[PDB]
Amino acid sequence: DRKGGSYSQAAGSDSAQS
Amino acid sequence: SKSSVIGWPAVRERMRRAEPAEEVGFPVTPQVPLRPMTYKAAVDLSHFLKEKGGLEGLIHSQRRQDILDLWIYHTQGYFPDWQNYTPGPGVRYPLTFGWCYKLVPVEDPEREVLEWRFDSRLAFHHVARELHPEYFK
Amino acid sequence: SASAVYVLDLKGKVLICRNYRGDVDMSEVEHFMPILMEKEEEGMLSPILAHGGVRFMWIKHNNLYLVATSKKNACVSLVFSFLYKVVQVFSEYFKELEEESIRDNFVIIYELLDELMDFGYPQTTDSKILQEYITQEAPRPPATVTNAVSWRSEGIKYRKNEVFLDVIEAVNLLVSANGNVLRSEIVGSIKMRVFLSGMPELRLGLNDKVLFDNTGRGKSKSVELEDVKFHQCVRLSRFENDRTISFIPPDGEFELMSYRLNTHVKPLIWIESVIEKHSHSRIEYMVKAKSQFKRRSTANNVEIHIPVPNDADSPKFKTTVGSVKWVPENSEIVWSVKSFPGGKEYLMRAHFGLPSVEAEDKEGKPPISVKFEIPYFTTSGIQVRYLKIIEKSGYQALPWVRYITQNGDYQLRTQ
Amino acid sequence: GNIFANLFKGLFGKKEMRILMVGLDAAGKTTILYKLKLGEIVTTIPTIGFNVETVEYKNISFTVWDVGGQDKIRPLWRHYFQNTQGLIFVVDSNDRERVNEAREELMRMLAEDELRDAVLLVFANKQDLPNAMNAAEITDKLGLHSLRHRNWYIQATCATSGDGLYEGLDWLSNQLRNQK
Amino acid sequence: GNIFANLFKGLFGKKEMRILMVGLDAAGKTTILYKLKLGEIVTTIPTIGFNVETVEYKNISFTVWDVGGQDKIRPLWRHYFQNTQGLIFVVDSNDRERVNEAREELMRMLAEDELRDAVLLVFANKQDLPNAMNAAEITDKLGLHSLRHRNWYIQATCATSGDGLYEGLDWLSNQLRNQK
Ligand SMILES: Nc1nc2c(ncn2[C@@H]2O[C@H](COP(=O)(O)OP(=O)(O)OP(=O)(O)O)[C@@H](O)[C@H]2O)c(=O)[nH]1
Ligand SMILES: Nc1nc2c(ncn2[C@@H]2O[C@H](COP(=O)(O)OP(=O)(O)OP(=O)(O)O)[C@@H](O)[C@H]2O)c(=O)[nH]1
Ligand SMILES: [Mg+2]
Ligand SMILES: [Mg+2]
Numbered sequence: 001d002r003k004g005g006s007y008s009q010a011a012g013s014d015s016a017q018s
Numbered sequence: 019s020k021s022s023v024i025g026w027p028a029v030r031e032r033m034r035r036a037e038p039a040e041e042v043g044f045p046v047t048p049q050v051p052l053r054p055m056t057y058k059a060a061v062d063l064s065h066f067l068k069e070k071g072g073l074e075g076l077i078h079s080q081r082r083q084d085i086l087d088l089w090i091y092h093t094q095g096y097f098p099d100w101q102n103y104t105p106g107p108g109v110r111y112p113l114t115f116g117w118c119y120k121l122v123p124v125e126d127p128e129r130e131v132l133e134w135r136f137d138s139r140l141a142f143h144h145v146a147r148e149l150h151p152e153y154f155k
Numbered sequence: 156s157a158s159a160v161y162v163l164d165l166k167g168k169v170l171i172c173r174n175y176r177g178d179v180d181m182s183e184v185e186h187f188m189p190i191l192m193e194k195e196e197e198g199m200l201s202p203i204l205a206h207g208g209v210r211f212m213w214i215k216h217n218n219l220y221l222v223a224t225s226k227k228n229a230c231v232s233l234v235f236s237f238l239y240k241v242v243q244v245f246s247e248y249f250k251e252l253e254e255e256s257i258r259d260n261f262v263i264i265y266e267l268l269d270e271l272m273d274f275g276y277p278q279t280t281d282s283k284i285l286q287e288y289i290t291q292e293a294p295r296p297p298a299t300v301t302n303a304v305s306w307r308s309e310g311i312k313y314r315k316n317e318v319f320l321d322v323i324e325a326v327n328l329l330v331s332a333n334g335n336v337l338r339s340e341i342v343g344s345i346k347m348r349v350f351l352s353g354m355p356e357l358r359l360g361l362n363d364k365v366l367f368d369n370t371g372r373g374k375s376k377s378v379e380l381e382d383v384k385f386h387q388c389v390r391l392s393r394f395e396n397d398r399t400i401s402f403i404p405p406d407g408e409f410e411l412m413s414y415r416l417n418t419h420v421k422p423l424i425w426i427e428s429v430i431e432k433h434s435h436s437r438i439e440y441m442v443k444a445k446s447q448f449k450r451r452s453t454a455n456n457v458e459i460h461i462p463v464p465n466d467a468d469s470p471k472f473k474t475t476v477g478s479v480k481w482v483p484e485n486s487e488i489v490w491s492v493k494s495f496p497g498g499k500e501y502l503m504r505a506h507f508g509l510p511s512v513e514a515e516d517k518e519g520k521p522p523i524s525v526k527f528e529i530p531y532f533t534t535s536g537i538q539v540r541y542l543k544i545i546e547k548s549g550y551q552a553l554p555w556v557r558y559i560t561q562n563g564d565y566q567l568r569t570q
Numbered sequence: 571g572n573i574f575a576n577l578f579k580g581l582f583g584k585k586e587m588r589i590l591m592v593g594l595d596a597a598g599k600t601t602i603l604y605k606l607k608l609g610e611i612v613t614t615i616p617t618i619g620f621n622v623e624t625v626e627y628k629n630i631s632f633t634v635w636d637v638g639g640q641d642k643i644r645p646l647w648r649h650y651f652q653n654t655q656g657l658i659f660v661v662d663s664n665d666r667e668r669v670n671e672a673r674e675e676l677m678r679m680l681a682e683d684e685l686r687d688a689v690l691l692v693f694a695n696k697q698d699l700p701n702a703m704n705a706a707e708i709t710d711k712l713g714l715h716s717l718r719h720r721n722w723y724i725q726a727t728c729a730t731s732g733d734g735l736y737e738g739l740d741w742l743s744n745q746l747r748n749q750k
Numbered sequence: 751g752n753i754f755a756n757l758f759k760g761l762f763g764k765k766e767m768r769i770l771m772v773g774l775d776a777a778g779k780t781t782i783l784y785k786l787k788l789g790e791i792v793t794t795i796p797t798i799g800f801n802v803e804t805v806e807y808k809n810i811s812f813t814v815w816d817v818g819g820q821d822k823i824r825p826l827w828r829h830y831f832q833n834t835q836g837l838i839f840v841v842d843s844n845d846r847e848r849v850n851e852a853r854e855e856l857m858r859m860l861a862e863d864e865l866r867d868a869v870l871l872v873f874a875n876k877q878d879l880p881n882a883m884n885a886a887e888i889t890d891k892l893g894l895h896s897l898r899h900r901n902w903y904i905q906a907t908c909a910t911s912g913d914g915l916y917e918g919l920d921w922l923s924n925q926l927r928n929q930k
Contacts, residue, residue, distance in 0.1 A: 332642075433864070
């Protein structure tokens with residue numbers, strides 16, 4: 001764990017925007 | 019998806035209860051990924067909704083659409099922006115490519131009654147993108 | 156257009172100086188200290204000094220004043236930017252900014268100063284580039300500085316491609332003594348610590364209000380930053396054209412984007428203070444803190460600083476949640492709380508005596524500031540959409556990002 | 571599922587309940603809260619922020635969140651309106667000039683859709699001087715009888731004497747808890 | 751923690767207590783303090799500043815800080831009000847003209863929130879002439895019976911004779927110490 005918010009995975013781009 | 023199947027009946031019941039016409043902050047689950055729904059994911063969600071029912075032929079409403087988007091985000095982490103309808107007047111195509119659900123008239127564009135209808139060609143034909151090339155970038 | 160940039164000391168001794176143009180005599184540094192002393196004693200002290208026809212612009216450093224004397228009408232903003240770059244380079248190279256490292260790395264310090272700027276025009280400003288050519292423990296200059304991409308060194312190889320982002324949120328609230336918030340601005344901070352192989356070009360994508368409106372998706376929660384500043388590697392052309400945040404990520408921790416817009420929402424922590432101060436008899440601290448943030452978010456390390464009397468002594472604290480400690484050096488009592496869950500209501504009752512003899516002069520009413528910091532909270536509601544990591548060789552990246560919400564200029568005016 | 575644990579907890583008392591402390595400044599709200607929690611007339615500085623305390627009576631811990639009547643603290647009562655089940659209004663029968671302000675504040679607090687499940691709790695504070703009104707004149711002036719869909723009761727409580735606080739607590743418990 | 755040392759100290763007597771010496775000039779306050787400390791009628795110059803002394807009685811060292819009744823020394827009594835647990839007022843029953851001034855000074859001293867835990871201590875000084883009033887007339891004139899939340903007792907003490915000082919000391923000890 002880590003203070004200030006756990007790290008979260010990020011996507012590559014807006015998949016719904018084509 | 020057992021969780022998605024379980025949440026589908028509750029989501030459908032909530033949408034049906036809401037008529038067709040309190041806490042502040044933006045909490046985020048720890049380690050939960052957030053990304054927009056993909057074309058394949060949108061197609062799978064549309065197929066699951068069509069198979070389970072409660073999505074095709076239901077009266078389109080802002081509250082029902084928001085509830086469905088929130089349920090989808092809770093169940094899979096997909097952003098509640100791919101379930102958008104094409105600008106009116108008339109049948110609104112899905113905003114995100116691959117979506118099999120679209121809103122069509124059932125009878126001002128706001129006062130027009132809209133109903134969700136399954137569209138298999140939507141997942142393969144970019145009708146919304148063709149209609150609004152500027153919105154698609 | 157400073158004539159020469161030099162590093163001073165707290166006693167007026169110049170730790171290190173390096174003339175760049177030679178149009179200003181090195182003896183003018185001696186008169187800088189008396190001028191600063193006279194300005195401080197009269198309230199006219201300014202960072203940009205003026206010794207006759209030569210201006211000695213100085214910046215208050217950690218332990219020495221970075222005085223950059225100038226003669227002609229040089230770019231004051233350019234001089235300040237050069238001083239900031241030099242300070243950043245020194246901080247990167249030396250972990251301590253004091254006289255201990257000023258006189259300990261003079262051999263490399265002189266070389267770094269010579270390579271940084273020549274004839275008053277800075278040339279090298281990249282910490283990585285400077286470290287790749289000048290070290291304290293020499294080859295030809297790197298081609299990265301000569302090449303267009305001066306913020307992403309090529310040829311870097313790593314076992315894994317992991318990038319750690321940080322969604323830093325600064326909640327600044329300017330609440331006047333009347334109970335109304337005057338300055339309520341939240342400044343975003345998108346800083347990513349990219350550590351991968353090669354020189355990938357990051358494709359930043361978030362739930363921007365402008366981007367959502369342009370794409371036709373302006374119906375969900377989108378963050379509309381009033382001021383958005385891109386990093387050095389961020390291409391301004393793509394952002395001006397279609398808001399495309401495409402740039403080469405740097406090697407290490409760097410600030411890609413920093414949102415800055417006003418906030419129209421209620422404060423995360425609502426603190427009401429009561430001052431039952433008797434006339435030279437006693438003092439009352441009726442401080443009540445209300446958590447306006449979501450109950451699912453907890454403000455870790457919340458320290459609501461309540462300024463106590465300057466001459467107050469023998470104070471008693473009667474609170475409910477959170478330890479209260481009076482620091483004589485700070486002349487105030489901080490309502491420190493380890494964990495502050497949202498919606499919590501903490502009430503405190505301070506009581507301390509006062510000296511019989513009245514104070515000769517007033518001490519003022521400094522504003523009360525809190526140090527609340529609740530991580531994993533997105534008050535602005537801006538959610539990152541995707542990060543386009545593309546490499547010529549081709550690899551699967553695993554970027555990560557964390558949202559941190561803290562209290563910035565959250566000062567409440569005293570009664 | 572099994573509710574054996576719930577039945578066991580309720581056999582010896584598990585209900586707690588909630589309460590709110592609101593009203594005009596100098597209306598005895600802080601004194602009323604202190605009497606409910608401690609039981610003595612202790613002089614305190616004005617409540618710049620808010621006071622949080624709990625009182626246990628009849629096996630129910632009715633926590634009361636005291637709110638000051640200050641101008642800078644009057645709009646801060648909305649923060650305590652979240653996750654609040656009760657609301658107590660402190661009336662100042664000895665402050666004719668501030669009576670209108672207290673009535674306006676009570677109407678504003680009761681005119682919110684969020685504060686709908688909390689019944690009216692009007693305490694006739696300052697019941698120690700002959701100028702204090704009765705339990706009907708104050709209610710008639712405040713118009714509590716016309717507040718439909720709200721369980722508002724007028725009770726006279728004197729901070730110095732302490733009489734009437736038990737009646738108000740019993741009325742609040744009856745309004746909140748409707749069991750044997 | 752352990753309180754064995756405290757119990758051992760209290761077994762043989764550890765309580766000391768405090769006292770104050772205030773009143774109008776020529777009211778026997780200095781004489782009363784000298785009698786409490788030494789026990790003799792010694793002639794002294796007027797107290798321009800203040801007199802500090804301690805008297806040990808009943809295993810309690812009741813220190814009395816004598817304060818003059820001079821105009822330049824009357825406002826200096828606030829300095830001794832800090833960290834003070836007792837307050838003794840010296841009345842001048844033989845000074846009818848100065849009786850009003852002494853009463854006003856006593857009211858001003860008792861009208862301070864800091865001096866609230868110190869009970870009233872009125873000594874009928876100058877109890878050697880027929881013009882001196884009784885223990886009830888002086889209290890009625892000074893209005894000590896209407897001083898609520900203050901343990902004020904009227905005692906007649908003559909500086910020349912010394913009678914009544916023991917009664918006043920016992921009353922002060924009872925007001926301060928409430929143990930066996
Ligand atoms: N002395 C006295 N005061 C009373 C009586 N009844 C009501 N009060 C009032 O109760 C107040 C007590 O002050 P607080 O403890 O601060 O409580 P409050 O009335 O809510 O005032 P705030 O906390 O500042 O909002 C006094 O100021 C009086 O005005 C009474 O019978 N006797
Ligand atoms: N001779 C005599 N004097 C008395 C008697 N009772 C009270 N006094 C007064 O006590 C005073 C003693 O003076 P001080 O020792 O200075 O004490 P004080 O009365 O407080 O006067 P200051 O210290 O100046 O404030 C005399 O001046 C008398 O006025 C008494 O029975 N006989
Ligand atoms: Mg109060
Ligand atoms: Mg004397």
